[PDB]
Short mmCIF file of N, CA, C and O in Angstrom, two decimals:
data_model
loop_
_atom_site.label_atom_id
_atom_site.label_comp_id
_atom_site.label_asym_id
_atom_site.label_seq_id
_atom_site.Cartn_x
_atom_site.Cartn_y
_atom_site.Cartn_z
N UNK A 1 -151.82 -13.45 39.57
CA UNK A 1 -151.73 -12.33 38.63
C UNK A 1 -150.23 -11.91 38.79
O UNK A 1 -149.67 -12.09 37.68
N UNK A 2 -149.76 -11.16 39.89
CA UNK A 2 -148.54 -10.90 39.97
C UNK A 2 -147.76 -11.74 41.08
O UNK A 2 -148.42 -11.82 42.04
N UNK A 3 -146.47 -11.91 40.79
CA UNK A 3 -145.86 -12.68 41.77
C UNK A 3 -144.21 -12.21 42.03
O UNK A 3 -143.71 -11.83 40.93
N UNK A 4 -143.82 -12.29 43.17
CA UNK A 4 -142.38 -12.08 43.31
C UNK A 4 -141.55 -13.14 42.43
O UNK A 4 -141.95 -14.24 42.30
N UNK A 5 -140.46 -12.58 41.95
CA UNK A 5 -139.76 -13.06 40.76
C UNK A 5 -138.23 -13.53 40.93
O UNK A 5 -138.06 -14.27 40.17
N UNK A 6 -137.70 -13.22 42.02
CA UNK A 6 -136.21 -13.33 42.06
C UNK A 6 -135.92 -13.35 43.76
O UNK A 6 -136.87 -13.47 44.40
N UNK A 7 -134.84 -13.82 43.96
CA UNK A 7 -134.41 -13.85 45.35
C UNK A 7 -134.56 -12.60 46.01
O UNK A 7 -134.57 -12.56 47.21
N UNK A 8 -134.83 -11.47 45.35
CA UNK A 8 -134.68 -10.31 45.92
C UNK A 8 -136.30 -9.81 46.17
O UNK A 8 -137.07 -10.34 45.79
N UNK A 9 -136.46 -8.70 47.32
CA UNK A 9 -137.74 -8.53 48.18
C UNK A 9 -138.91 -8.08 47.22
O UNK A 9 -140.17 -7.82 47.99
N UNK A 10 -138.71 -7.22 46.07
CA UNK A 10 -139.81 -6.43 45.68
C UNK A 10 -140.06 -6.67 44.11
O UNK A 10 -141.18 -6.62 43.86
N UNK A 11 -139.07 -7.12 43.48
CA UNK A 11 -139.25 -7.39 42.01
C UNK A 11 -140.29 -8.60 41.72
O UNK A 11 -140.38 -9.47 42.28
N UNK A 12 -141.02 -8.35 40.76
CA UNK A 12 -142.07 -9.13 40.27
C UNK A 12 -142.23 -9.47 38.85
O UNK A 12 -141.83 -8.51 38.16
N UNK A 13 -143.19 -10.24 38.28
CA UNK A 13 -143.60 -10.15 37.02
C UNK A 13 -145.13 -10.50 37.05
O UNK A 13 -145.62 -10.69 37.88
N UNK A 14 -145.73 -10.09 35.95
CA UNK A 14 -147.17 -10.53 35.75
C UNK A 14 -147.10 -11.80 34.88
O UNK A 14 -146.20 -12.18 34.14
N UNK A 15 -148.08 -12.76 35.49
CA UNK A 15 -147.84 -14.28 35.20
C UNK A 15 -148.61 -14.31 33.59
O UNK A 15 -149.37 -13.69 33.44
N UNK A 16 -148.38 -15.39 32.96
CA UNK A 16 -149.08 -15.94 31.96
C UNK A 16 -150.36 -16.25 32.43
O UNK A 16 -150.73 -16.81 33.56
N UNK A 17 -151.42 -15.95 31.51
CA UNK A 17 -152.99 -16.34 31.86
C UNK A 17 -152.65 -17.72 32.13
O UNK A 17 -152.12 -18.52 31.48
N UNK A 18 -153.49 -18.25 33.17
CA UNK A 18 -153.38 -19.51 33.56
C UNK A 18 -152.48 -19.83 34.61
O UNK A 18 -152.95 -20.98 35.41
N UNK A 19 -151.58 -18.92 35.18
CA UNK A 19 -150.93 -19.16 36.24
C UNK A 19 -151.10 -18.14 37.43
O UNK A 19 -150.58 -17.25 37.63
N UNK A 20 -152.30 -18.70 38.10
CA UNK A 20 -152.91 -17.73 39.16
C UNK A 20 -152.30 -17.87 40.59
O UNK A 20 -152.89 -17.29 41.63
N UNK A 21 -151.18 -18.52 40.68
CA UNK A 21 -150.53 -18.79 41.89
C UNK A 21 -149.15 -18.40 42.19
O UNK A 21 -148.30 -18.01 40.99
N UNK A 22 -148.60 -18.30 43.28
CA UNK A 22 -146.98 -17.67 43.36
C UNK A 22 -146.53 -18.61 44.24
O UNK A 22 -147.02 -19.38 45.10
N UNK A 23 -145.29 -18.81 43.98
CA UNK A 23 -144.54 -19.89 44.84
C UNK A 23 -143.26 -19.48 45.29
O UNK A 23 -142.51 -18.39 44.64
N UNK A 24 -142.74 -19.92 46.43
CA UNK A 24 -141.25 -19.46 47.05
C UNK A 24 -140.84 -20.98 47.17
O UNK A 24 -141.51 -21.60 47.99
N UNK A 25 -139.56 -21.26 46.93
CA UNK A 25 -139.15 -22.63 46.92
C UNK A 25 -137.82 -22.42 47.55
O UNK A 25 -137.15 -21.32 47.31
N UNK A 26 -137.65 -22.97 48.55
CA UNK A 26 -136.26 -22.92 49.24
C UNK A 26 -135.25 -24.49 49.43
O UNK A 26 -136.04 -25.39 49.73
N UNK A 35 -130.79 -22.13 48.49
CA UNK A 35 -131.27 -21.18 47.59
C UNK A 35 -132.80 -21.01 47.68
O UNK A 35 -133.32 -21.68 48.00
N UNK A 36 -133.16 -19.71 47.38
CA UNK A 36 -134.54 -19.24 47.13
C UNK A 36 -134.90 -18.72 45.73
O UNK A 36 -134.40 -18.23 45.03
N UNK A 37 -136.02 -19.45 45.23
CA UNK A 37 -136.49 -19.22 43.92
C UNK A 37 -138.06 -19.10 43.92
O UNK A 37 -138.86 -19.75 44.83
N UNK A 38 -138.64 -17.98 43.25
CA UNK A 38 -140.05 -17.50 43.47
C UNK A 38 -140.45 -17.23 42.16
O UNK A 38 -139.62 -17.17 41.11
N UNK A 39 -141.59 -17.61 41.76
CA UNK A 39 -142.11 -17.14 40.46
C UNK A 39 -143.91 -17.81 40.29
O UNK A 39 -144.43 -17.82 41.36
N UNK A 40 -144.26 -17.63 39.20
CA UNK A 40 -145.88 -17.76 38.97
C UNK A 40 -145.81 -19.47 38.79
O UNK A 40 -145.01 -20.10 38.51
N UNK A 41 -147.15 -19.73 39.13
CA UNK A 41 -147.32 -21.28 39.02
C UNK A 41 -148.66 -21.24 38.79
O UNK A 41 -149.81 -20.67 38.85
N UNK A 42 -149.40 -22.68 38.35
CA UNK A 42 -150.52 -23.13 37.93
C UNK A 42 -151.18 -24.00 39.03
O UNK A 42 -152.04 -23.98 39.64
N UNK A 43 -150.23 -25.05 39.38
CA UNK A 43 -150.62 -25.97 40.57
C UNK A 43 -149.33 -26.01 41.29
O UNK A 43 -148.27 -25.86 41.08
N UNK A 44 -149.74 -26.31 42.67
CA UNK A 44 -148.73 -26.17 43.76
C UNK A 44 -148.10 -27.23 43.72
O UNK A 44 -148.60 -28.54 44.17
N UNK A 45 -146.56 -27.40 43.46
CA UNK A 45 -145.79 -28.57 43.45
C UNK A 45 -145.72 -29.13 44.96
O UNK A 45 -145.63 -28.43 45.91
N UNK A 46 -145.71 -30.48 44.94
CA UNK A 46 -145.55 -31.21 46.16
C UNK A 46 -144.18 -30.91 46.92
O UNK A 46 -143.36 -30.89 46.27
N UNK A 47 -144.26 -30.65 48.18
CA UNK A 47 -143.12 -30.38 49.07
C UNK A 47 -142.15 -31.62 48.98
O UNK A 47 -142.71 -32.91 48.95
N UNK A 48 -140.96 -31.79 49.37
CA UNK A 48 -140.16 -32.83 49.40
C UNK A 48 -138.96 -32.83 50.38
O UNK A 48 -139.16 -31.75 51.53
N UNK A 49 -138.15 -33.95 50.62
CA UNK A 49 -137.15 -33.98 51.54
C UNK A 49 -136.28 -32.78 51.55
O UNK A 49 -135.93 -32.20 52.53
N UNK A 50 -135.78 -32.29 50.41
CA UNK A 50 -134.87 -31.35 50.51
C UNK A 50 -135.32 -29.99 49.83
O UNK A 50 -134.38 -29.15 49.44
N UNK A 51 -136.32 -29.88 49.48
CA UNK A 51 -137.14 -28.79 48.80
C UNK A 51 -138.48 -28.43 49.36
O UNK A 51 -139.39 -29.09 49.29
N UNK A 52 -138.57 -27.15 49.92
CA UNK A 52 -139.76 -26.85 50.62
C UNK A 52 -140.60 -25.77 49.71
O UNK A 52 -140.04 -24.66 49.12
N UNK A 53 -142.02 -26.06 49.51
CA UNK A 53 -143.02 -25.29 48.49
C UNK A 53 -143.90 -24.47 49.28
O UNK A 53 -144.70 -25.13 50.23
N UNK A 54 -143.72 -23.17 49.22
CA UNK A 54 -144.80 -22.30 49.78
C UNK A 54 -145.50 -21.97 48.56
O UNK A 54 -144.95 -21.44 47.71
N UNK A 55 -146.87 -22.11 48.68
CA UNK A 55 -147.89 -21.53 47.55
C UNK A 55 -148.96 -20.93 48.04
O UNK A 55 -149.72 -21.05 49.13
N UNK A 56 -149.22 -19.65 47.55
CA UNK A 56 -150.34 -18.76 47.79
C UNK A 56 -150.92 -18.40 46.71
O UNK A 56 -150.46 -18.61 45.62
N UNK A 57 -151.95 -17.72 46.79
CA UNK A 57 -152.97 -17.12 45.73
C UNK A 57 -153.37 -15.71 45.55
O UNK A 57 -154.21 -15.53 44.88
N UNK A 58 -152.52 -14.87 46.07
CA UNK A 58 -152.77 -13.48 45.98
C UNK A 58 -151.43 -12.59 45.41
O UNK A 58 -150.40 -13.29 45.86
N UNK A 59 -151.50 -11.40 44.92
CA UNK A 59 -150.41 -10.75 44.34
C UNK A 59 -149.04 -10.53 45.47
O UNK A 59 -149.43 -10.39 46.53
N UNK A 60 -148.06 -10.90 45.09
CA UNK A 60 -146.73 -10.73 45.71
C UNK A 60 -146.77 -11.33 47.06
O UNK A 60 -145.88 -11.00 47.94
N UNK A 61 -147.58 -12.46 47.17
CA UNK A 61 -147.70 -13.18 48.35
C UNK A 61 -146.48 -14.09 48.61
O UNK A 61 -146.53 -14.40 49.99
N UNK A 62 -145.70 -14.47 47.83
CA UNK A 62 -144.67 -15.41 48.09
C UNK A 62 -143.24 -14.90 48.53
O UNK A 62 -143.35 -13.92 49.50
#
């Protein structure tokens, strides 16, 4: 529902209905998501399913 949104520690948005998950990708990018994208050689995906968990 709510997810961290920026490389900064507290900022968030409420997600589009249907985007029930939060992701931190590591530069650092965070935001709302529907399905947890596969991790890769040079990009790491953390995915969690509770408010501001990323």
